[PDB]
Amino acid sequence: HCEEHLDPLSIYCEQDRTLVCGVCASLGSHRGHRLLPAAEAQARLKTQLPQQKMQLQEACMRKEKTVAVLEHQLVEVEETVRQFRGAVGEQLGKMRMFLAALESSLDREAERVRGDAGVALRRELSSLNSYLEQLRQMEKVLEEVADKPQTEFLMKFCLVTSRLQKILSESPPPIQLPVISDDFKFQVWKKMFRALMPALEELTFDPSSAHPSLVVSSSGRRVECSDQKAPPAGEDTRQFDKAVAVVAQQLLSQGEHYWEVEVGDKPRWALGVMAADASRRGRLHAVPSQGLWLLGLRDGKILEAHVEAKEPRALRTPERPPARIGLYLSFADGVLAFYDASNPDVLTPIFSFHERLPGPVYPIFDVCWHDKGKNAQPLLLV
Amino acid sequence: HCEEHLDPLSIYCEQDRTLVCGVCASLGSHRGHRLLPAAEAQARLKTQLPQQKMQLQEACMRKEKTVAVLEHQLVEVEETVRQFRGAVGEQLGKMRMFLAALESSLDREAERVRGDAGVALRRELSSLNSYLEQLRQMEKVLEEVADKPQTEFLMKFCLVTSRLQKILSESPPPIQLPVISDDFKFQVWKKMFRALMPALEELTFDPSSAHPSLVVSSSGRRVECSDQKAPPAGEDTRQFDKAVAVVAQQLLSQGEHYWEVEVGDKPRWALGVMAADASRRGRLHAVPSQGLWLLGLRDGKILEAHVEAKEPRALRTPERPPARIGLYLSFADGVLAFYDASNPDVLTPIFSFHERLPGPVYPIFDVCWHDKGKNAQPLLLV
Ligand SMILES: [Zn+2]
Ligand SMILES: [Zn+2]
Ligand SMILES: [Zn+2]
Ligand SMILES: [Zn+2]
């Protein structure tokens, strides 16, 4: 069955992977090569089948896992796509809607003022029309009196003479016009930069860490400072001895939150933002690298900002002392907002940390000591 | 006909303003009073009518003119109402639509990105599906290989094994995922302060007052400096002798307008406001009382704004040399806007005078002399 040597090729030449016969395995192209039988050949096929099966199935598992991961990250990618589509719509919604609603409100206010003015002026026109009607009727009666029967025409003059003089003595009585201008666009856009702020939030205090220097009352809504007496401190798990302070109960140190408060002008102090990575005792110069950022104020006009560095920083004096501060917190890009809005309709920023040190802070604040009662400004909500 | 003296009442008692008769004027209530003949009384009526006619008609004129003036201011009130509603709509449209156009552009960008990601991963998954189909088809030879004649089943293994190994080995390696974040506040405010721009303006030069030292070309939009020579040419109203400068022909001192310009790197210069109602001769002795305010910079970094007074005012020293400036003009309150936009999507303000000086200005600006060729930088528009 060799077709040239007539032996059924029944020997494997593992040196040459060749099916061979007597002469084919003895000489020719396989003069000194290896010879294997066909029963051992089938046996070795049966022996090497399982590992090749396992290789096939493991490659299939690899590619199946790859496809599954590709489609899973596809659904996650489109989940992010749709979610940010909806979030973008949300942002537009808030801002655009607020602006449009306020504009419609101003439109109805102007319409109401115009309607009131129109009603008043229509009443005035009705009064003057009644005056004119009286004039016309009395003058036609005057024409009659002039050209009516002789004797009584000679008589009747004095009534109308006196009435004319008296109604001339009846003197008719002898304004609020706020029209727009071109600066309104610009100042309204300034007010929109103010209006970037969102709505109110959940507001409750927590007087737990109150060192006996300040005072909190009104169901934990009103907080101010005074000097009742001078008792030493008292400590709890996270309280302090010399660094008087007070916290708020809400603690959601991720995502974004916001609200506004007022402080005003206070004689002298230093305060800032606090994280657990540093010391908490005394009025020492704390290193903001360990989560204690400082900023001191005197004269309601002079601010020195203890830098993320060695010594304090100077701040250029503003054109007006500050009045009110709004706070906004988020942690995706070190989002920290603490800005002054002297009136709640205007806004210019102050500063921010452009470096990204997360340093999870704790909501807790305090102002420096009274020093004979010069440091008593309050705070509330809403 | 007296009913008490039986005399037809024919005497007026002007002493008692009483129409009486003969006996009534002789005795009774007018025993020694004044007497009028009553024929002359009818004559007095006919004679004295016209002046009282004029008085009553003047009262009617007062009423009519008062009503006319009130109604004229009424029509002006409703004209203002409708017109400022329309103007409010004009602003609303401009700003809101502009911003919406940008967000829609971002929407198309997001849709295209989603499509591109889908296309790439669809191509890869289709290739992998073809791979898996090939794997299954090649594995299907299982039945024949297991139960077919001995010899060829012993033989045919090698090249199919090698092809399987190659197609398993050729795995292509691959995240570019720009989803929104919380820095949206800062970057979106940058781009919204960019989108604040109203439309462009008509900008063309006028080389009539060009002192022959520098050169302007590119259809009167590009301007630069060189020194062929410096001869003082024939001079006109707004030409110069040593303080080289050149003006523009356009003068539209009404409405509101805006445009963009570039500055680049220049050694030292000065700028402010100049009007044609004052001098233009020599080294520009500018009178800030007449709307010619000066403000000087040197070293490319230091600017001081000279008021018409003893101490000029300081500007906090900036962090960066200027790149590009945008200008905006309006005439309701001396509205002057000059802000730095290094790239057209970023913007930083400088300052402004809140006072209202109409002061019809002349459009012209200029830099100091070449001074060793350091001041030979060109300028164009956007
Ligand atoms: Zn043979
Ligand atoms: Zn061989
Ligand atoms: Zn009588
Ligand atoms: Zn009398």
Numbering used by the authors:
A (entry chain A), B (entry chain B): 85 to 258, 263 to 470
Please quote the authors directly.
Tripartite motif-containing protein (TRIM)72 (mitsugumin 53; MG53) has been determined to rapidly nucleate vesicles at the site of membrane damage, but the underlying molecular mechanisms remain poorly understood. Here we present the structure of Mus musculus TRIM72, a complete model of a TRIM E3 ubiquitin ligase. Its domain organization includes an RBCC domain followed by a PRY motif associated with a SPRY domain identified in splA kinase and ryanodine receptors (PRYSPRY) domain.
To obtain a high-resolution model, numerous constructs were generated, purified and crystallized; however, most of them diffracted poorly. After introducing point mutations and deletions, we were finally able to resolve molecular models of mouse TRIM72, including RING-deleted (ΔRING, 2.75 Å; the highest resolution is in parentheses), full-length (FL, 4.6 Å) and wild-type (WT, 7.1 Å) TRIM72. TRIM72 is a tight dimer, as determined by size exclusion chromatography (SEC) coupled with multiangle light scattering (SEC–MALS), and its overall shape was determined to be elongated in solution by SEC coupled with small-angle X-ray scattering (SEC–SAXS). The overall structure of the TRIM72 dimer has an elongated shape. The coiled-coil domains (CCDs) form the main scaffold of an antiparallel dimer with a length of approximately 17 nm.
